[PDB]
Design a protein around this ligand. Structure first.
Ligand SMILES: *Cc1cccc(C*)c1
Ligand SMILES: [Cl-]
Lengths: 298, 19
C-alpha cells in the first residue's frame, strides 16, 4: 500500500522520462542480470545488460537507480542500477557466498564517433583517396543528421596513462571535449582522425568509436594500387604494406564495427550507409517524441 | 577478368571518384 503508491510515482517518472533528452551515455564494464530481489522501483522494468553494452541515461531516479535505455532498436527506457547499487548487489553476492593481495560504467559520447582505418596508412595516396570518397559520400547521404570534422590532434593520447608539451596535451583534451559536445544532441559524428590507423590506438580512450575498416583483402591488389600512384608513392610501399597486414592480423569481431571489403565504391558506401541508418534507429527510438494529434476526439 | 583484376579495377575506379 505504501509500496503500490511508491510504484505509481516511479512509473509516472518513467513515463515522463520517455521524451526527455539523453543526459549522457555509458559503456558498461560489467554485466547485470536483473533479479526480483534487486528491489526495482517498478518490478519487471530493470534494464539488464552485458559488458561492453551502451546505455543512454535520461535522469537519476534515486541513489540506487537511473532511468535510461539500452542503445538497441526496440529497447525502451527502464531502470538502470547506479554504481552504488551494483556495488551493493556485488556485496550481497559476496556475503551470501562467504594480507598482501573496477568502475562499472565509463562515460562515452552519446553517439559513438565514426572513425575510418585502412586500407593502409593515412597521409599516403591510396588510403587518403579511398577514404575521401567515403567521407564525400557520408556528407551528402546524411545531410541534416551528421557532423564530419577533422582531428589533427593525437587523440590516441587521451588516456589517464598519459594525462609531450603541456599545450599539446591540453589540445588533445579539448578535442575529446569537442567530440563529446558534437554528439550531445544525437547527430551522427564522423571524425577524419589523422593519427589513427589502427583500432588499438583508441581502445583505451573514452571515445568508444565506431571503427570502420576499409579492407583490401588481397595484398597483391594493394601493392598494385600503390604502384598505380607512381614511383613517388611506390617508394613507400613497405610501410604501407606492413600497416595493412597489421589490420589484417586483428581479431575482427572485437576490433571493428563495420568491415568494408567490397571492391566497388557504390557497394562499400551502401553497406556503410545501411549500418549507420541502423545505428540512427537504435539511438532515436520513436518513443522519444509523442505524436501531437491533428484532430481531437470531441 | 580474374577476381584480382576485378578487385583492382573496382579500387582504381573508386580512387578516380575521389578527384
Ligand atoms: C578499371 C576501370 C574501368 C572502368 C572505369 C573505371 C573508373 C575503372
Ligand atoms: Cl552522481
Amino acid at each position: 500500500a505504501v509500496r503500490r503508491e511508491a510504484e505509481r510515482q516511479a512509473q509516472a517518472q518513467l513515463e515522463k522520462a520517455k521524451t526527455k533528452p539523453v543526459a549522457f551515455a555509458v559503456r558498461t564494464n560489467v554485466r547485470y542480470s536483473a533479479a526480483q530481489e534487486d528491489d526495482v522501483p517498478v518490478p519487471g522494468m530493470a534494464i539488464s545488460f552485458e559488458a561492453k553494452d551502451f546505455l543512454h541515461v535520461k535522469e537519476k531516479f534515486n541513489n540506487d537507480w537511473w532511468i535510461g535505455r539500452l542503445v538497441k532498436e526496440g529497447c525502451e527506457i527502464g531502470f538502470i542500477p547506479s554504481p552504488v547499487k551494483l556495488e551493493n548487489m556485488r556485496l550481497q553476492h559476496e556475503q551470501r557466498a562467504k594480507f598482501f593481495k573496477t568502475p562499472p560504467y565509463d562515460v562515452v559520447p552519446s553517439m559513438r564517433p565514426v572513425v575510418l582505418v585502412g586500407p593502409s596508412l593515412k597521409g599516403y595516396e591510396v588510403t587518403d583517396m579511398m577514404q575521401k570518397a567515403l567521407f564525400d559520400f557520408l556528407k551528402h547521404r546524411f545531410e541534416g543528421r551528421i557532423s564530419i570534422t577533422r582531428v589533427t590532434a593525437d587523440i590516441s593520447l587521451a588516456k589517464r596513462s598519459v594525462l609531450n608539451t603541456r599545450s599539446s596535451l591540453a589540445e588533445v583534451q579539448s578535442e575529446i571535449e569537442r567530440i563529446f559536445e558534437l554528439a550531445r544532441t544525437l547527430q551522427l559524428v564522423v571524425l577524419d582522425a589523422d593519427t589513427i590507423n589502427h583500432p588499438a590506438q583508441l581502445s583505451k580512450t573514452s571515445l568508444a568509436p565506431i571503427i570502420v575498416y576499409v579492407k583490401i583483402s588481397s595484398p597483391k591488389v594493394l601493392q598494385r594500387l600503390i604502384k598505380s600512384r607512381g614511383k613517388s608513392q611506390a617508394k613507400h610501399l613497405n610501410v604501407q604494406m606492413v600497416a595493412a597486414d597489421k589490420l589484417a592480423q586483428c581479431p575482427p569481431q572485437e576490433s571493428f564495427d563495420v568491415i568494408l571489403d567490397e571492391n566497388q565504391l557504390e557497394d562499400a558506401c551502401e553497406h556503410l550507409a545501411d549500418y549507420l541508418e541502423a545505428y540512427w534507429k537504435a539511438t532515436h527510438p520513436p518513443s522519444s517524441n509523442l505524436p501531437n494529434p491533428l484532430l481531437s476526439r470531441t | 577478368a580474374s577476381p584480382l583484376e576485378e578487385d583492382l579495377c573496382g579500387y582504381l575506379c573508386w580512387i578516380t571518384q575521389a578527384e
